[PDB]
């Protein structure tokens, strides 16, 4: 959990939401990443799971950004 909390911060600032998605999406890219990091498999599983939520949380911001922006427009039309 310590390693997970630390990892969450790292992927929030240094890694962009766009970059985070390419990693999480492609199995080939994830394998190369966990191998370079020399992660035990259990930690790799924990990391992907924790990162899935972070991505979803950032996509919720973008989906809300698209929705708020439409309502932002629709209000000015009246």
């Amino acid at each position, epitope marked *: 959990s310590i390693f997970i909390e630390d990892a969450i911060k790292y992927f929030k600032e240094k890694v962009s939401t766009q970059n985070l998605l390419l990693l999480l999406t492609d199995n080939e890219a994830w*394998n190369g990443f*966990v*191998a370079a990091a020399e992660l*035990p*498999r*259990n930690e*790799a*599983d924990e990391l992907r799971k924790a990162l899935d939520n972070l991505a979803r949380q950032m996509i919720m911001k973008d989906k809300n950004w698209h929705d708020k922006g439409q309502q932002y427009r629709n209000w000015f039309l009246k």
Partner: antibody, heavy 121, light 108 residues
Framework: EVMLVESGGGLVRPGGSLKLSCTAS????????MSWVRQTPEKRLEWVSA????????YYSDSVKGRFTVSRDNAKNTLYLQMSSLRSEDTAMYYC??????????????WGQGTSVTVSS | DVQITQSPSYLAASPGETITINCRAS??????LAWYQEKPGKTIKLLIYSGFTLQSGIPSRFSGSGSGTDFTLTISSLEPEDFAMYYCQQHNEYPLTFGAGTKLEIKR
């Protein structure tokens, strides 16, 4: 059927050198990570080394680090283990083994019959 | 290194019976524990990987269970060919580490 055949084993003196080879058959060798495992006279299994499918990463046990070098020739379907500064404790049956491809480190789904190495004066 | 304690070292049983072999890892390794069978004149065979998944072609007599650091291999309805040497191994991280093994002998 998957087949692994080790060779290059034999007699060696303390401080001597041996290069083991493992020819792989019945599958696409270049697709799979490989490991070297040995069984001592006390029938203890001991993992020694491993190499990724493309030799990007190599791994060694502490007992062997700095003395052994794992390599591979995908074109010749062959796995190698160059052993240097051999000790009496290196006396064992040496197996090569194919790793399952779910994770870069994984279980060993196929083993060779093994090649014997005896380190003695 | 992950230290693995395999027990018992020896097992005496008869055909038709059920036995279990245990393995405890020195740290949490999730499910990534493998079971191997060794018989004379034969290559070492993978029975089960990732704790509970049978390898293709392995008989249904074998099954894998576990909890936390502990893992258990079951062999039920024992056949004569099942009497052999058994080893556990974690494949969660390098270096791969093995249990000291279990010899399953014929009771008489």
């Amino acid at each position: 059927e998957v087949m692994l055949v080790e060779s290059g084993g034999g007699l060696v003196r303390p401080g001597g050198s041996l290069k083991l080879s493992c020819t792989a058959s019945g599958f696409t060798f270049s697709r799979c990570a490989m490991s070297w495992v040995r069984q001592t006279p006390e029938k203890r299994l001991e993992w020694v080394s491993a190499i990724s499918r493309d030799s990007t990463y190599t791994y060694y046990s502490d007992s062997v680090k700095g003395r052994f070098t794992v390599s591979r020739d995908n074109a010749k379907n062959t796995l190698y283990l160059q052993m240097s500064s051999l000790r009496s404790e290196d006396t064992a049956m040496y197996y090569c083994a194919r790793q399952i491809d779910d994770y870069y480190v994984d279980a060993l789904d196929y083993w060779g019959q093994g090649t014997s190495v005896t380190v003695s004066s | 290194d992950v230290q693995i304690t395999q027990s018992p070292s020896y097992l005496a049983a008869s055909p038709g019976e059920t036995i279990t072999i245990n393995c405890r890892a020195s740290k949490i390794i999730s499910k990534y524990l493998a079971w191997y069978q060794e018989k004379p004149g034969k290559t070492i065979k993978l029975l089960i990987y990732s704790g509970f998944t049978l390898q293709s072609g392995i008989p249904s007599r074998f099954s894998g269970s576990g909890s936390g650091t502990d893992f258990t291999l079951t062999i039920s309805s024992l056949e004569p060919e099942d009497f052999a040497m058994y080893y556990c191994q974690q494949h969660n991280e390098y270096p791969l580490t093995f249990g000291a093994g279990t010899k399953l002998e014929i009771k008489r």
